[PDB]
Design a protein around this ligand. Structure first.
Ligand SMILES: O=P(O)(O)O[C@H]1[C@@H](OP(=O)(O)O)[C@H](OP(=O)(O)O)[C@H](O)[C@H](OP(=O)(O)O)[C@H]1OP(=O)(O)O
Ligand SMILES: Nc1ncnc2c1ncn2[C@@H]1O[C@H](COP(=O)(O)OP(=O)(O)OP(=O)(O)O)[C@@H](O)[C@H]1O
Ligand SMILES: [Mg+2]
Ligand SMILES: [Zn+2]
Length: 420
């Protein structure tokens, strides 16, 4: 009844850069929340890929996947034919992860086209709010023609929490050698804290142990969340309506000092309804109920355990996949006696586990003022949602780095334990 021009593909131009604020960032992507007008963007974030400042198929053409990654992920043509890295992460989540993890807490993204001018702006603008050692190691990849749009998981007063639970299980492989028996006793997360000190990457050993979080015991789950609150590092963040109010911003943070402790107790003023000196403890018993009560950590743990054999065994399958003289083996004859397809599934499955040990989850909480919980103490009812984030695809080449880091972790823990 009045001409509406047919559909078109959204393309953020240089104009539209002023509409997004720095939200955070990891070692790979740059997240920014929307501050403007359009309903196509109210309550959404945009995920832009950074590129390390140090760094192609056999015609010297930039390539989404090596041949081996091509072969390894071939059980899905959609996925191994992705022309750029955004559809690739978008099809990894839809075709590999969502079938494993269920679709209810996992939102594959939506691609938006973007100009090089857009990306060159957001970089210039945000580099103020980034931690300094993030800029000096990765800027915005100003070649991509796509970026990711997701729902913002700190909105719908609202208080959101972000957990990075990491690997919550002990290996039991035959391929773990006697000198490394400790790996069957101490969580890699625990043995990793030492080496991180020996590199001033944290200042205090973490209170947190992922064996508690994943124990499935609501009691030890509460220990974890209390341990997270205490020594947050890069495992625990809290935001009040979009803004951080505990934990690091694109980085980890030192112990929670009482000063922070009192700033957080009041930060919760009114959201939690309680008397001073008791709102922090309620907030922690409310996050523990939403964690436990969703059963979301359980299937998460099921994927992590696709790491059946530990890097000490999967490493050997990898030098098969890329046909190579196993450096490790010198003088298995077993793992190396496996049909190619079985070599492939171990390496494949190990990398899908690496995705699960590395994602985060975000529980979001709104006010009284269906899906919910009720603080046993303060007679309040909050509603919540839980979502995963950073289900990225780990590059195959990294099997060698996975191994070399594992080797160092236990090698360091061994000696620092024998020293006594
Ligand atoms: O231990 P390394 O290798 O440095 O890094 C870990 C991980 O690599 P991998 O675990 O998949 O090998 C990185 O993956 P990427 O983001 O590059 O895809 C990040 O998730 C990083 O987080 P960050 O510390 O930057 O926040 C992790 O460190 P964490 O141990 O502190 O969680
Ligand atoms: N959908 C979302 N809603 C709200 N915040 C988000 C969302 N996605 C990412 N973030 C924030 O941006 C930060 C970095 O994003 P993301 O994890 O996707 O990139 P990454 O570099 O792979 O990081 P990580 O290794 O921490 O998962 C996260 O720590 C998170 O707080
Ligand atoms: Mg990542
Ligand atoms: Zn070998």
């Amino acid at each position: 009844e009045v001409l509406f021009q047919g559909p078109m593909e959204m393309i953020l131009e240089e104009k539209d850069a002023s509409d997004w604020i720095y939200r955070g960032e990891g070692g790979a992507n740059l997240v920014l929340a929307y501050a403007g007008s359009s309903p196509l963007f109210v309550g959404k974030v945009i995920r832009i890929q950074k590129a390390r400042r140090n760094d192609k198929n056999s015609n010297g053409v930039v390539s989404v996947l090596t041949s081996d990654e091509q072969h390894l992920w071939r059980e899905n043509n959609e996925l191994i034919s992705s022309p750029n890295k955004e559809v690739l992460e978008q099809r990894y989540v839809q075709n590999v992860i969502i079938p494993l993890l269920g679709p209810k807490h996992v939102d594959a993204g939506v691609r938006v086209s973007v100009s090089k001018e857009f990306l060159e702006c957001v970089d210039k603008k945000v580099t103020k709010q980034r931690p300094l050692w993030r800029v000096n190691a990765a800027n915005v990849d100003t070649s991509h023609d796509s970026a990711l749009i997701l729902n913002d998981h700190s909105l719908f007063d609202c208080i959101s929490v972000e957990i990075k639970p990491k690997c919550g299980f002990l290996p039991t492989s035959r391929f773990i050698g006697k000198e490394n028996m400790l790996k069957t006793s101490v969580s890699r997360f625990k043995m990793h804290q030492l080496l991180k000190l020996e590199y001033i990457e944290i200042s205090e050993e973490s209170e947190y142990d992922p064996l508690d979080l994943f124990s499935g015991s609501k009691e030890r789950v509460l220990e974890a969340i209390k341990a997270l609150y205490s020594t947050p590092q890069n495992n625990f963040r809290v935001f009040l309506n979009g803004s951080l109010i505990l934990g690091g911003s694109g980085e980890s943070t030192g112990r929670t000092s009482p000063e922070i402790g009192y700033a957080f107790e009041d930060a919760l003023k009114g959201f939690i309804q309680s008397e001073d000196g008791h709102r922090t403890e309620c907030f922690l018993q409310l996050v523990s109920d939403a964690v436990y009560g969703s059963g979301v950590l359980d299937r998460l743990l099921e994927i992590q355990k696709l790491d059946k054999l530990d890097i000490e065994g999967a490493i050997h399958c990898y030098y098969d996949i890329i046909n190579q003289p196993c450096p490790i083996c010198k003088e298995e004859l077993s793992l190396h006696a496996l049909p190619l397809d079985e070599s492939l599934k171990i390496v494949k499955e190990y990398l899908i586990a690496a995705t699960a040990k590395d994602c985060s989850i975000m529980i979001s909480f709104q006010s009284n003022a269906g899906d919910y919980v009720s603080l046993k103490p303060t007679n309040q009812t909050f509603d919540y949602k839980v979502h995963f984030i950073d289900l990225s695809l780990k590059p195959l080449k990294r099997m060698e780095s996975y191994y070399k880091l594992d080797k160092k972790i236990i090698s360091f823990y061994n000696r620092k334990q024998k020293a006594e």
